[PDB]
Amino acid sequence: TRTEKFYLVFTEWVKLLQRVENNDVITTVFIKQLVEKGVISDTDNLLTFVKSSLELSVSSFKESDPTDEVFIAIDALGSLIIKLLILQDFKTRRDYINAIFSVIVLVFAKDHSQEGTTFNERPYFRLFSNILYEWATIRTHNFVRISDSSTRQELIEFDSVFYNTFSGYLHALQPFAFPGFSFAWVTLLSHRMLLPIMLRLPNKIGWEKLMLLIIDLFKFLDQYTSKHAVDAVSVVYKGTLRIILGISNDMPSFLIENHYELMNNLPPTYFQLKNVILSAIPKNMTVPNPYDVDLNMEDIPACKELPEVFFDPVIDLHSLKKPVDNYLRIPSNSLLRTILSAIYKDTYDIKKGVGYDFLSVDSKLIRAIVLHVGIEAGIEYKRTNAVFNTKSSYYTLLFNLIQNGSIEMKYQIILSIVEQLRYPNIHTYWFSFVLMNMFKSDEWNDQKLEVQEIILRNFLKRIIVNKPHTWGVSVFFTQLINNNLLDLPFVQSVPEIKLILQQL
Amino acid sequence: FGLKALVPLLLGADLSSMLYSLGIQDHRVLDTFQSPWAETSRSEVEPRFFTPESFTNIPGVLQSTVTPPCFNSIQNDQQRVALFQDETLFFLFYKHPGTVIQELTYLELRKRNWRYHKTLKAWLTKDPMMEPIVSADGLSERGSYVFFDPQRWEKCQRDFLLFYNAIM
Amino acid sequence: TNAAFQNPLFNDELKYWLDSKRYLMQPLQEMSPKMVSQLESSLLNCPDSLDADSPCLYTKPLSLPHPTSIFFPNEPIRFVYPKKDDDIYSRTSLARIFMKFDLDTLFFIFYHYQGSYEQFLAARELFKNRNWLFNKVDRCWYYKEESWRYFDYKKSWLARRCGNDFVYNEEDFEKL
Numbered sequence: 001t002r003t004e005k006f007y008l009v010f011t012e013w014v015k016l017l018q019r020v021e022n023n024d025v026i027t028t029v030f031i032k033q034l035v036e037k038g039v040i041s042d043t044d045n046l047l048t049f050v051k052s053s054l055e056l057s058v059s060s061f062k063e064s065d066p067t068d069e070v071f072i073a074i075d076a077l078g079s080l081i082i083k084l085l086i087l088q089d090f091k092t093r094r095d096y097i098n099a100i101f102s103v104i105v106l107v108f109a110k111d112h113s114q115e116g117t118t119f120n121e122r123p124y125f126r127l128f129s130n131i132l133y134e135w136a137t138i139r140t141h142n143f144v145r146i147s148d149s150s151t152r153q154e155l156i157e158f159d160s161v162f163y164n165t166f167s168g169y170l171h172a173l174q175p176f177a178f179p180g181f182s183f184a185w186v187t188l189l190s191h192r193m194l195l196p197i198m199l200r201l202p203n204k205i206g207w208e209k210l211m212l213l214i215i216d217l218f219k220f221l222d223q224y225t226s227k228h229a230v231d232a233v234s235v236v237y238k239g240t241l242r243i244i245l246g247i248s249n250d251m252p253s254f255l256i257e258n259h260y261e262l263m264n265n266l267p268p269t270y271f272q273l274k275n276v277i278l279s280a281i282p283k284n285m286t287v288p289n290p291y292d293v294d295l296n297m298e299d300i301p302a303c304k305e306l307p308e309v310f311f312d313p314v315i316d317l318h319s320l321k322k323p324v325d326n327y328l329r330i331p332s333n334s335l336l337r338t339i340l341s342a343i344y345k346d347t348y349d350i351k352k353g354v355g356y357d358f359l360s361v362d363s364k365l366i367r368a369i370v371l372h373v374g375i376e377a378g379i380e381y382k383r384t385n386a387v388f389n390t391k392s393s394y395y396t397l398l399f400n401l402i403q404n405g406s407i408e409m410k411y412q413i414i415l416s417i418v419e420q421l422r423y424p425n426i427h428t429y430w431f432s433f434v435l436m437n438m439f440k441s442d443e444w445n446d447q448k449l450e451v452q453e454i455i456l457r458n459f460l461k462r463i464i465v466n467k468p469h470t471w472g473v474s475v476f477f478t479q480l481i482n483n484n485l486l487d488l489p490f491v492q493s494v495p496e497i498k499l500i501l502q503q504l
Numbered sequence: 505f506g507l508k509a510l511v512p513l514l515l516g517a518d519l520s521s522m523l524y525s526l527g528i529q530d531h532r533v534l535d536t537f538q539s540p541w542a543e544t545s546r547s548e549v550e551p552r553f554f555t556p557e558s559f560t561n562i563p564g565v566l567q568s569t570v571t572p573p574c575f576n577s578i579q580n581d582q583q584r585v586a587l588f589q590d591e592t593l594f595f596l597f598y599k600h601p602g603t604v605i606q607e608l609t610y611l612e613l614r615k616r617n618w619r620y621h622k623t624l625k626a627w628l629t630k631d632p633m634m635e636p637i638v639s640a641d642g643l644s645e646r647g648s649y650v651f652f653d654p655q656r657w658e659k660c661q662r663d664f665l666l667f668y669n670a671i672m
Numbered sequence: 673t674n675a676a677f678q679n680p681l682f683n684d685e686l687k688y689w690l691d692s693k694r695y696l697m698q699p700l701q702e703m704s705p706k707m708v709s710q711l712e713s714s715l716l717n718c719p720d721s722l723d724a725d726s727p728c729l730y731t732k733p734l735s736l737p738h739p740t741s742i743f744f745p746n747e748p749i750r751f752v753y754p755k756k757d758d759d760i761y762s763r764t765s766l767a768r769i770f771m772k773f774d775l776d777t778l779f780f781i782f783y784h785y786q787g788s789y790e791q792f793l794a795a796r797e798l799f800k801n802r803n804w805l806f807n808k809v810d811r812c813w814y815y816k817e818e819s820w821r822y823f824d825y826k827k828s829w830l831a832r833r834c835g836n837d838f839v840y841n842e843e844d845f846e847k848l
């Protein structure tokens with residue numbers, strides 16, 4: 001008669017929410033009178049009640065006709081959960097929310113993976129969306145709708161916990177783990193009562209879990225997208241692109257300050273999405289016409305500012321950190337030699353493909369080193385002169401990394417460098433200087449034309465694609481057509497790219 | 505070095521239409537974000553919003569003895585409905601089908617010399633600046649009218665051949 | 673590792689949960705036929721805006737049922753667009769059309785859909801775009817042109833002047 005107790009309780013709840021408004025004090029009296037009886041006080045009773053209500057609600061969805069309200073029980077359940085969080089005294093609230101999410105994802109998993117499955121993603125999606133809405137509705141204006149000032153303060157403190165918990169479970173519900181939920185999952189990632197809030201929690205405490213989720217997405221895309229592997233996945237890409245566009249519009253600093261991890265996990269053939277992420281521009285900045293031939297970054301204050309980096313790439317340099325910093329601080333040729341050897345030893349990896357192993361360049365590490373050199377360069381410039389110089393440790397380190405590297409090594413270095421050409425800031429400026437000097441350098445050991453072709457390639461990848469183009473790339477390319485191109489031998493060797501060039 | 509490279513064969517997509525699909529001056533689009541896909545973005549969604557307590561339980565609206573107000577009486581609610589402007593009646597008529605207030609706004613609009621077109625589901629009224637000319641069979645008249653367009657919230661003048669079996 | 677997963681009441685479920693971790697144990701995989709099916713049906717059941725929309729199981733009725741003409745609309749209308757800074761509501765069909773609404777219709781909506789989003793947007797139009805102020809104490813909307821006026825929602829449904837002895841006390845007005 002305990003099963004019947006929980007079933008009847010939930011049924012009565014559903015009937016009530018179809019008769020009175022959600023905020024009706026009759027509801028509050030219901031929950032408090034529910035909690036006086038103690039029928040869900042003890043842990044097993046609570047887990048059993050949430051489980052049974054969940055199963056009944058999902059079944060209710062399944063056995064309803066589309067013309068009905070198929071989410072009634074689900075909707076009521078969302079309300080009941082958040083009201084159970086609000087209207088109780090908590091000695092432990094994190095333990096509660098964690099328990100409830102646990103029950104949900106457990107029932108979810110069994111519904112999804114079992115043999116004769118009749119799984120639908122929608123009722124669970126609806127459950128999560130509703131939870132999001134309910135919390136969104138009670139949280140407005142620092143939980144002002146909560147009467148007790150103590151309880152109010154408690155919820156205020158709990159807010160961030162709520163969102164990072166939700167995100168944690170959402171993370172565990174990612175496409176790799178539960179493909180049958182994928183689209184719903186993606187929708188939840190960009191839910192209007194999840195993404196804009198976690199983009200905006202104070203001191204960026206929402207950014208990490210967001211990046212976790214976005215990385216999950218990118219990885220899922222990369223696994224099932226190649227140049228040859230041409231479908232559902234493409235649909236998922238399209239949605240992703242929409243989401244990233246929204247983010248670029250609303251919170252560009254999120255795309256700007258996470259470009260390292262975002263590039264580390266982004267599929268290499270997603271040219272457009274790469275440009276979209278790197279074209280992000282801080283909210284109230286207006287950029288100069290990038291095609292202005294008479295442009296000069298010396299005459300732009302913005303080009304002297306240091307961009308923010310949410311995750312310091314130096315971590316990913318591991319032991320290399322200490323030597324690389326040494327050489328940058330006070331350069332010498334023997335130290336240069338040593339760290340070149342160290343870097344090479346770490347960047348030339350053996351990757352395990354299917355049926356055979358092969359040599360592989362550690363492109364993530366390369367990006368980390370290039371970004372690190374850029375950051376330290378910008379910092380040295382702010383400290384103050386000798387940073388925009390060929391003799392400088394930063395330029396020399398990148399130069400010699402390219403010079404003594406394999407063709408793949410060269411291409412990767414130059415790629416990460418071009419990635420750093422974004423909005424007007426000190427990185428875009430300095431790396432443009434670096435690139436141009438490399439293009440014009442007379443210090444290449446019989447690899448001048450190779451470097452030039454690699455550079456030119458890395459730019460055509462960024463401009464012969466549809467808009468957006470990043471500011472620095474449009475600028476650099478403009479300076480490239482109007483300096484000291486078609487006379488280059490390797491450009492003549494190919495008529496197809498020669499033509500696209502000729503349009504320019 | 506063939507691969508590293510200068511031999512590409514021929515991503516890319518015009519993002520203009522996709523950007524117009526979202527809400528793009530500076531404007532947040534994410535707080536009204538319907539879905540990651542267009543084909544499945546088939547309705548606007550309710551954003552977060554703040555309702556002060558003073559917005560609720562407002563007593564005595566138009567002398568109502570109950571809170572919130574309601575319109576449940578054909579006989580007694582005409583006096584309240586009469587106080588509303590044409591547009592407000594249109595709003596009610598298009599928002600509450602099969603209710604007392606739809607019937608009361610129909611009757612009130614009818615009284616203000618609006619006529620309801622059955623197949624267009626749109627209200628029209630005579631443009632005073634011209635006199636109708638009834639057709640020879642008497643089943644229609646040709647005249648100048650003002651139609652109300654509830655999607656543009658506009659009165660719209662039109663020369664029109666109007667059939668009497670089509671209005672009520 | 674977590675407390676609810678280790679309860680016998682969920683033992684069976686736990687198995688499937690643990691299965692979800694399999695993709696971590698094997699390094700990389702071409703898409704299983706099964707996974708293709710799952711992904712295909714996830715595409716099929718993809719949640720739409722209506723699924724993502726806010727829940728509402730009950731609203732106090734505005735008006736009793738009545739036998740109306742079959743020629744009237746039989747479903748509620750859905751509006752779609754065919755400091756006055758920008759906010760998240762600025763480009764919604766509702767907000768954009770409320771810009772075209774008469775004070776009469778805005779005041780109606782404000783007092784007859786209390787607690788609703790329509791009310792919220794009406795109040796927003798009134799406050800943000802027409803410089804009316806709302807009073808916590810008498811629930812009236814005021815407007816200033818030393819001469820004040822208020823909309824008499826209680827009786828006359830018109831704008832009435834306040835007396836000469838009216839003073840604006842900010843503590844009595846709602847901060848919007």
Ligand SMILES: [Ca+2]
Pocket residue numbers: 346347348349362365
């Ligand atoms: Ca390595």
